[PDB]
Symmetry: C3
Subunit: 321 residues, 3 copies
Amino acid sequence: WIFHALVFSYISFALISDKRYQKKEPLISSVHTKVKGIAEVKAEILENGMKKMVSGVFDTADYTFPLQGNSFFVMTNFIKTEGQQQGLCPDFPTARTICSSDRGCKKGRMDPQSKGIQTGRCVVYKERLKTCEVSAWCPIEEVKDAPRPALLNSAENFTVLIKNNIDFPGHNYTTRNILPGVNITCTFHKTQNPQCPIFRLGDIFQETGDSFSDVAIQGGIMGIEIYWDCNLDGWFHHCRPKYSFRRLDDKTTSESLYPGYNFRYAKYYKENNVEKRTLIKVFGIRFDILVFGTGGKFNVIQLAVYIGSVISYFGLATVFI
Amino acid sequence: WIFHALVFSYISFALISDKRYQKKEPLISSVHTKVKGIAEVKAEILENGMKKMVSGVFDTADYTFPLQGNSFFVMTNFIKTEGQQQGLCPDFPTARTICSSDRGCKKGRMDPQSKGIQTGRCVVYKERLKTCEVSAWCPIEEVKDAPRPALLNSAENFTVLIKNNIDFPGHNYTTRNILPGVNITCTFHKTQNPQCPIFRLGDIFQETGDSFSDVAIQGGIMGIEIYWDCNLDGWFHHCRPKYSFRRLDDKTTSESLYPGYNFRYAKYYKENNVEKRTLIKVFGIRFDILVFGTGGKFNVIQLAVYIGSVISYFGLATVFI
Amino acid sequence: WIFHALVFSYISFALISDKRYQKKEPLISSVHTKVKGIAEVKAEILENGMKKMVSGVFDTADYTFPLQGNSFFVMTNFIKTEGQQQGLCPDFPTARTICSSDRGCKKGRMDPQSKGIQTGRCVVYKERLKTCEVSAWCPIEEVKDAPRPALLNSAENFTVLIKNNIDFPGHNYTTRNILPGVNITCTFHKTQNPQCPIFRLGDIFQETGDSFSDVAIQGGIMGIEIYWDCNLDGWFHHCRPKYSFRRLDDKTTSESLYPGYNFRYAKYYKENNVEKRTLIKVFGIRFDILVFGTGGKFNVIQLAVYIGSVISYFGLATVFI
Ligand SMILES: O=C(NCC1(N2CCN(c3ccccc3)CC2)CCOCC1)c1cccnc1Sc1ccccc1
Ligand SMILES: O=C(NCC1(N2CCN(c3ccccc3)CC2)CCOCC1)c1cccnc1Sc1ccccc1
Ligand SMILES: O=C(NCC1(N2CCN(c3ccccc3)CC2)CCOCC1)c1cccnc1Sc1ccccc1
Ligand SMILES: *[C@@H]1O[C@H](CO)[C@@H](O[C@@H]2O[C@H](CO)[C@@H](O)[C@H](O)[C@H]2NC(C)=O)[C@H](O)[C@H]1NC(C)=O
Ligand SMILES: *[C@@H]1O[C@H](CO)[C@@H](O[C@@H]2O[C@H](CO)[C@@H](O)[C@H](O)[C@H]2NC(C)=O)[C@H](O)[C@H]1NC(C)=O
Ligand SMILES: *[C@@H]1O[C@H](CO)[C@@H](O[C@@H]2O[C@H](CO)[C@@H](O)[C@H](O)[C@H]2NC(C)=O)[C@H](O)[C@H]1NC(C)=O
Ligand SMILES: *[C@@H]1O[C@H](CO)[C@@H](O)[C@H](O)[C@H]1NC(C)=O
Ligand SMILES: *[C@@H]1O[C@H](CO)[C@@H](O)[C@H](O)[C@H]1NC(C)=O
Ligand SMILES: *[C@@H]1O[C@H](CO)[C@@H](O)[C@H](O)[C@H]1NC(C)=O
Ligand SMILES: *[C@@H]1O[C@H](CO)[C@@H](O)[C@H](O)[C@H]1NC(C)=O
Ligand SMILES: *[C@@H]1O[C@H](CO)[C@@H](O)[C@H](O)[C@H]1NC(C)=O
Ligand SMILES: *[C@@H]1O[C@H](CO)[C@@H](O)[C@H](O)[C@H]1NC(C)=O
């Protein structure tokens, strides 16, 4: 009766809306990014208790790294420990490193917080303050915070140009993030330019509602999501990206869980016939470009199997009344 | 009647062909590549208007980068700007950089095309030609094209050895790209050696129909696809790779969309007690190894559910006549 | 009759166990690792036939590389060829390089085993032993084995801290590897600490049953699997990682298939106004963090379609008797 027409209607609807006539294949993604922008570093940092003038112009080669694994990194802050060489030196004053006597130092001791192996001697670091002498790259990098305003704070004004190429192998269909002939000069805006592949980093942090400066002080991990909802039927054809932004780092703020994003980068060189090293603690934001999607095209066997689930609601819907 | 036997036959066929008795799980891929080959660079390049002799032998450490994220890079061309140091200098003559007077330069101006921050002064670059003086790594890298024949043109003769390891966790089945005891000495050929994991790069560009030289001049992004169609039933067992090749870069040829593949690599050093930098614009092909596949093994619940869609064509096929 | 209740029971069971009422979406993973530990290298290596003292303290910046593509590398051994410069030199004595006369050397010949291009001359390498003179980075790196105990053998005591963030976009559900407030100080143990994100590398090799020392001599590729079985219904809620460990390298032990894991890292520098290079053959373990999983939440259309397969066993189960 009428309930049968409503069962046919709701069933065929669930078919249409849920695209069950379609077979759905996962996508294959390739990413290629070009980061643009420079930054001028004028700041006053404190090195070893003394004030020091940090200046210099930073371009692409000085703060970024080519995209490896659908992700790129933009340095936003740094601490620089210059002139290190293999030797013996008192470890940096810390609750774990301070020693009253040689009894507080055990030869061969290693500590997660330290970067050296103890010799077993208690030596003076400054004045009457004593720390356990270690063998390491000397002098030891100080335990301090990253610069109070991030040295490369201007990075929010930088631009990332993203090129995404997706392919569905089963359906033999290839398409790319940028269709031909589009006006490339634009900034991505949620509404004004939803297809602009040019992203201002500050814009991204506003979309996720995080402040770029705060994250820039100690680093973070941001996420650029490129969603691909795709239809390959022709009766309704659509297959373009949807750009969303999600902040990926944990924001723990606990010294035990290593917050932010940073890494220790070495620059080796020789000086006065001695092996030497300039260690730079590098702070910045890692952007992770996550491309996910599904491509649909009608399958007879799928539409069949669905019908086979559906005739049982024809008959069973008849048996209900 | 006969239509019922044809419905059972077409249904059970769709089962067999579409492997619907089988549950299908996605694969997990690990890649490990070893690139072999060297190249001799004898060429004459033009630096700052003057001819210069570019020579040298390039081995693995000089042109490639270990595989990060199922992809490896092979440099094929380069422009080298040596001796840069932080300072002030006239920007390179360009439609956007040429100034008639100090009125064309605004102090603090930054430009996507430039690598510096303007001081607000109009200075001479050469002769009577004036550009806006900038603060940057000086001298500025010239605006020129990459060498006319690619300096590392020999890269087409290089070899990539690919090692792929796939695992299906649900089915607890692990297999690798190279089965034991195979004659490793071979070049992959579509027909003569379809299982050779040794790929000549030129061969790859011929398969995709792109010329290796052209792409090598300004760089590109190529794609090595490893398809895994796999059957874990035993009645029919097959699970080997299918190597296909697809060119991934967009081939735009528009100065606004940054064509090819290149990146700006810095080499820092100290000289005459001055912080100095040799900037190399690096051109090459990025190879993206895309491993996709599906592993099938018969599922009772799946075969069931399919039968449950199928009995409705038994009965409904009876009701049709 | 009773067989109908057993068909309803086995069917509804297959529903419950196989979670067919649930729609299942694949996960999105982001990884962030921090490696901790240092190593002291005291060893005696043989360079060019003469004994040499290898010593030095190695920290994070000296042996690891930030996580690129859900994978990180820990160097465990190395051979160091210092002072190389572009020139001519006899290739290293090898079955393929040894020449009786200039007839054994062809000008322009390149060989997979060699790192140079032959000049076509047969010269003395040592004493009366002759090899084919090549143009390359000179002197050529010796053909030898990696140090007999791995120089960075202590790497098994190192620690990897893994931070995984997964997201299901369709279900709008985000969760991370580390829930808040957990006691971070711990070592992952299969039973004692199944949720500890802190992994000792030696522990990992014991779990996979490989010896860390052996692999550390010539390198390897290990696999850290993070499985995510997840339920988003609330009636039964569970969504945590399962850490498993699988050794990914092929363990071929054949000189033709490049066993282990190693790469040739160049350190360029200038000396006596000559372009020079220190080549280091780097041996270590690459860890591949493989995050896979599935998130389930009940779907009306799915539960429907299943019922539609099921009523045909109601009726067909009736027709069987
Ligand atoms: O040197 C500095 N940064 C260089 C970094 N590079 C990037 C490019 N890498 C790279 C490597 C291989 C292939 C391709 C690319 C290398 C490493 C370091 C890691 O983080 C990103 C940038 C640095 C930091 C802090 C203050 N200064 C300066 S250099 C400087 C000196 C004087 C004036 C201005 C800048
Ligand atoms: O130096 C040159 N190329 C080195 C590259 N490397 C690769 C290896 N990287 C790497 C880094 C970390 C871990 C593991 C690996 C570093 C960067 C640069 C980026 O592109 C690939 C090669 C270079 C370019 C243009 C003319 N010359 C020369 S060097 C030279 C000088 C004189 C004679 C012959 C070669
Ligand atoms: O130099 C040595 N190792 C440095 C490695 N780095 C890591 C960090 N990379 C990196 C690059 C860009 C961004 C971020 C990071 C660079 C390359 C080399 C590749 O393998 C990992 C470590 C090395 C090897 C063998 C003996 N010695 C020494 S240095 C030394 C000298 C004297 C005393 C102690 C150590
Ligand atoms: C990013 O760029 C904007 C625009 O150039 C900067 O904002 C300008 O700042 C200057 C002085 O710093 C002011 O005179 C302008 O009025 C500002 N313009 C706008 C539109 O706000 C901003 O400071 C830059 N960000 C960083 C971190 O340097
Ligand atoms: C790649 O290698 C081939 C083979 O060695 C090169 O082709 C040879 O070139 C030499 C002179 O350049 C000729 O004498 C040979 O007859 C050629 N052999 C063949 C089979 O063609 C080729 O030039 C190399 N490619 C590049 C870019 O250097
Ligand atoms: C990893 O660390 C352990 C613990 O410090 C080392 O084992 C100790 O070795 C010292 C001397 O080498 C002995 O005196 C201790 O009794 C050992 N302790 C234990 C618990 O075994 C081990 O040698 C380190 N591994 C490497 C490769 O250096
Ligand atoms: C995919 O479709 C295009 C359409 O022209 C065709 O040229 C190409 O050969 C197809 N791919 C395969 C593998 O058949
Ligand atoms: C692109 O759009 C901008 C406005 O946002 C406009 O100024 C510019 O001229 C356009 N480019 C072209 C080539 O039309
Ligand atoms: C996978 O199968 C092998 C076959 O011998 C078995 O040894 C191994 O334990 C299985 N894996 C698991 C997790 O049970
Ligand atoms: C591998 O095949 C080649 C021919 O392509 C042959 O010359 C070589 O001897 C073979 N290797 C072995 C070990 O049989
Ligand atoms: C996901 O759920 C949270 C729950 O509060 C909500 O705030 C958020 O807006 C949801 N995401 C979307 C895209 O609606
Ligand atoms: C964490 O557990 C260890 C024992 O494994 C204990 O010594 C330590 O005090 C605990 N930390 C906290 C904060 O409770």
